[PDB]
Amino acid sequence: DSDINFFPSSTLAAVYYENFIKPTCSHIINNGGLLDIYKKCTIKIIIPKKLTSDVNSQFQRIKAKIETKELSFEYLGRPRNINVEVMIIDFPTILSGINYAISNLLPVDYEAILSRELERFVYTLKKIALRDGFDDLIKIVDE
Amino acid sequence: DSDINFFPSSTLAAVYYENFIKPTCSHIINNGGLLDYIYKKCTIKIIIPKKLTSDVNSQFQRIKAKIETKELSFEYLPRNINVEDGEVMIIDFPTILSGINYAISNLLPDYEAILSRELERFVYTLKKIALRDGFDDLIKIVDE
Numbered sequence: 001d002s003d004i005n006f007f008p009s010s011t012l013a014a015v016y017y018e019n020f021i022k023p024t025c026s027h028i029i030n031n032g033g034l035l036d037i038y039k040k041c042t043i044k045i046i047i048p049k050k051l052t053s054d055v056n057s058q059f060q061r062i063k064a065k066i067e068t069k070e071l072s073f074e075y076l077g078r079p080r081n082i083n084v085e086v087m088i089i090d091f092p093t094i095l096s097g098i099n100y101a102i103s104n105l106l107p108v109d110y111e112a113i114l115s116r117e118l119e120r121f122v123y124t125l126k127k128i129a130l131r132d133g134f135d136d137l138i139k140i141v142d143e
Numbered sequence: 144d145s146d147i148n149f150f151p152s153s154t155l156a157a158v159y160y161e162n163f164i165k166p167t168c169s170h171i172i173n174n175g176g177l178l179d180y181i182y183k184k185c186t187i188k189i190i191i192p193k194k195l196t197s198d199v200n201s202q203f204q205r206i207k208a209k210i211e212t213k214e215l216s217f218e219y220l221p222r223n224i225n226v227e228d229g230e231v232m233i234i235d236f237p238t239i240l241s242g243i244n245y246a247i248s249n250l251l252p253d254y255e256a257i258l259s260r261e262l263e264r265f266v267y268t269l270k271k272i273a274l275r276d277g278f279d280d281l282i283k284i285v286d287e
Contacts, residue, residue, distance in 0.1 A: 008147065008154045008158075014245050014250055017249065019245070104160065105157055128249055
């Protein structure tokens with residue numbers, strides 16, 4: 001099945017979108033905003049400048065610099081919690097899985113390979129968000 | 144860059160392995176067991192559904208109710224696990240299996256067979272890498 005062979009970045013971007021991004025964007029457009037009601041909403045997705053070993057350390061240092069309050073909204077019979085600043089702050093810790101997939105599935109240039117994968121992860125998010133009409137809701141920012 | 148083109152199942156299996164399996168197994172090997180008293184006999188039981196459908200989470204919600212678990216904690220390099228007389232069964236549900244359909248549906252512009260083989264590929268890849276790193280005895284994959 002050559003057609004279902006994807007980069008780990010492409011695969012994890014689609015997984016990250018369906019898990020933590022698309023449910024939040026669908027709820028906001030359905031209710032015209034974030035409901036306990038907030039009219040203006042932004043989902044800020046912070047991307048590290050480089051993809052290095054222990055991505056969790058990078059995000060742990062980044063989360064400390066931001067102050068967030070916990071909020072909750074129900075969707076699909078599920079209470080869902082988000083960290084807000086309205087600014088919904090979400091850290092893609094799933095980026096560590098890019099290096100997890102490559103190192104376990106393969107038998108300088110590696111740092112270049114990770115820089116290309118981080119690009120494809122971000123561009124995949126912009127594409128599916130553009131497809132679903134969520135481009136004004138989702139803002140990707142760097143450190 | 145053709146070499147880093149994998150099946151979504153293989154990508155997610157290695158992600159699930161590094162996120163949960165490998166740290167829990169490495170902790171067992173270092174402590175000679177599960178330190179909460181150390182339980183010397185520890186096995187991780189991974190429960191997978193028989194079919195990859197939509198709403199795999201509802202499948203796991205159905206599977207959790209049939210199993211009785213107690214929360215335990217340990218520290219590796221704080222982590223929480225659900226366990227089940229000297230022999231401890233660490234129970235884990237790979238809810239990441241929902242990502243296989245998330246990947247194929249989003250990354251592509253009959254379908255039951257593809258998800259069927261992807262579930263097998265997830266299980267095969269997980270066993271393959273666990274066998275490589277020497278954690279095969281601590282891992283057991285079963286279904287409902």
